[PDB]
């Protein structure tokens, strides 16, 4: 009559906040760039032919892109495709035999690199092998007659050469979920981050993300919606990393005009070491032709989003990174299997007033890397046969800011930070993991039998 019960439903639209594990998906197609599993696409399973996005009206779930447990899940993947394409190749501790290096065969005009030579073994055990290679003066360092050299890692790390088969080109991956868990997307335009987002949408597989080894800037990435995204966990804390995501790509023409010869050195049996073959003729260093028109275009767009952050009539400075390793001070990015650092001093320097050619950037090359600071496992990047032109969408930016100084009269800004969790976050800023609680209850007038 009027004595209420409880009634059980199954499949109610209900969810909570909980963190868990996803899985990779690169369609039934990305497998065909081959190059013996570029990066990570091998045993990973193809994607479903249609990622269903369902928009939600009248749904205000509180979001988080910073403590977001997926920004850290992403940072862990790049280490294991490394390890499971590292531990089964060529370990190179014999490469810590003293070297003899010299400014190369030129009319001087010094030389950045060295025409080196040193001692190794061959197919046979008793008999051994000397062979010459060419190293950047960054890759090597002196020791104490001429100046004698040795490799930079030998005072820190043993080394394992990678395999030239596995290409280090960042390969896109979708992030997908199973039953009981799913992914939210705050597709909204004017989205300020912290907390409730009025137009949530839900998906099974996120939009494809590229693991581009890119500090400061971001390349081959995700464009913004409407305005330019300007994020920072705490803008009043210059130790917090500040990250940019443009909606417009700046063009870059990175290349390395050198025909490289791969010397196949027997140091095994089996193990094949690659030495710098005689570089062909005229000598030019790696660079990137940046369209200055596209550069200053996105410059004026974001700068004007910033006077709204400080009074009404102000003075805004721009400078280069105040200091940091090559990943921090320069623009670091892989280019064909090798690694470039393009001296961002030729980008950050300006001041304008109240009323065809191309800039280009000088890039260095680094092969020996102890990246991921996994002291115990460093590596050598195999050499690349073929000039590496590389265009990509300049997508992001990582920077900080100065301190107190003289107030109001001005305040300055400069790039830095470096830490790749921001660059990874620029691809996951709009996502949040939840768990479904499909059981629902209510008191109706319904009774069963006894």
């Amino acid at each position, epitope marked *: 009559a009027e004595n209420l019960w409880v009634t059980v439903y199954y499949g109610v639209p209900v969810w909570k906040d909980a963190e868990t594990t996803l899985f990779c998906a690169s369609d039934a197609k990305a497998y065909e760039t081959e190059k013996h599993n570029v990066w990570a696409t091998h045993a990973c399973v193809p994607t479903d032919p249609n990622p269903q996005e369902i928009h939600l009206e009248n749904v205000t779930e509180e979001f988080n892109m910073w403590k977001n447990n997926m920004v850290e899940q992403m940072h862990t993947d790049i280490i294991s495709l490394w390890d499971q394409s590292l531990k089964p190749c060529v370990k190179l501790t014999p490469l810590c035999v003293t070297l003899q290096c010299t400014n190369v065969t030129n009319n001087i005009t010094d030389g950045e690199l060295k025409n080196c030579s040193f001692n190794m073994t061959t197919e046979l055990r008793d008999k051994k092998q000397k062979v010459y290679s060419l190293f950047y003066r960054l890759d090597v360092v002196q020791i104490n007659s001429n100046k004698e050299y040795r490799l930079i890692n030998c005072n820190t790390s043993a080394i394992t050469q990678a395999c030239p088969k596995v290409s280090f080109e960042p390969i896109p991956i979708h992030y997908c979920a199973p039953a009981g868990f799913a992914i939210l997307k705050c597709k909204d335009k004017k989205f300020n981050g912290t907390g409730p987002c009025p137009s949530v949408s839900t998906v099974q597989c996120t939009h494809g993300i590229k693991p581009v080894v890119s500090t400061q800037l971001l390349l081959n990435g995700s464009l913004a919606e409407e305005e330019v995204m300007i994020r920072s966990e705490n803008i009043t804390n210059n*130790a917090k990393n500040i990250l940019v995501q443009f909606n417009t790509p700046v063009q870059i023409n990175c290349t390395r005009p050198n025909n490289n010869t791969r010397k196949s050195i027997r140091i095994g049996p089996g193990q094949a070491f690659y030495a710098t073959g005689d570089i062909i003729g005229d000598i030019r260093q790696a660079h990137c032709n940046v369209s200055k028109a596209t550069w200053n275009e996105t410059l004026g767009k974001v700068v004007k989003q910033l006077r709204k952050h400080f009074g009404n009539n102000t003075i805004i400075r721009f400078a280069n990174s105040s200091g940091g*390793d090559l990943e921090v001070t320069t623009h670091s990015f892989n280019c064909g299997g090798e690694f470039f650092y393009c001296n961002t001093s030729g980008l950050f320097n300006s001041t304008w007033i109240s009323n065809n050619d191309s800039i280009t950037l000088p890039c260095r090359i680094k092969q020996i890397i102890n990246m991921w600071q996994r002291i115990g496992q460093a590596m050598y990047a195999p050499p690349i046969q073929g000039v590496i032109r590389c265009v990509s969408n300049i997508t992001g930016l990582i920077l900080t800011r*100065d*301190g*107190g*100084s003289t107030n109001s009269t001005t305040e*300055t800004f400069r790039p830095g*930070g*470096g830490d790749m969790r921001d660059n990874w976050r620029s691809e996951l800023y709009k996502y949040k993991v939840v768990k479904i609680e499909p059981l629902g209850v209510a008191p109706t007038r319904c009774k069963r039998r006894v």
Partner: antibody
Amino acid sequence: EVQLVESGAQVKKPGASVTVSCTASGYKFTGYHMHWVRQAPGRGLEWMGWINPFRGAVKYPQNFRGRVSMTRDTSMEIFYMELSRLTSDDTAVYYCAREMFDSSADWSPWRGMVAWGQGTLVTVS
Amino acid sequence: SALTQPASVSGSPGQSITISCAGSSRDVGGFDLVSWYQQHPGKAPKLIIYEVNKRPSGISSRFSASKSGNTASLTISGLQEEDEAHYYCYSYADGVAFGGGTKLTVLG
């Protein structure tokens, strides 16, 4: 226990710059922000710069940027700094000191200097 | 400078002291990040208090600080010669606020 250990004493002339260091041990170097601050005897402490040892991010004030360059090493396990362009008004006891709340992912703040070096003296006359 | 410290302070052997740290609602009021220090004239310091009122394990229980809106404070009761030292403060401020040096003298 963990420590922050600095070098000895060095006396200089005007128009110079000084090597002053502060090594560390007892923990995993890579995750500890570090500052160089200078104290006048019985006065106060003035800030010149800080370092993120994860790839070397540094920052200074504006009476220092250009003068101060500042770095570290992550397997030799040591912090450096050299304020360049010395005058007779730049004498101080320089202290390395580590923050309270660092990590390897998120960040904050600027607080809490528990572990202190003994202080390295630099004189200019 | 970058932090409002007092010109000179004073206290007597056998009594007690306390110090005011005042600012705006943008620096102390909204950020639980205020730390305090004690250092003999020229000696190695050690953190007295952090996060408004927390000491490291090894610091005396005679120390304890506060945060009242835009006016924070540290209080010491029962002065011994353990406290014949110079005193400093610290506050949250964009990059970092740095004090100008409060000298401990005798008032009168």
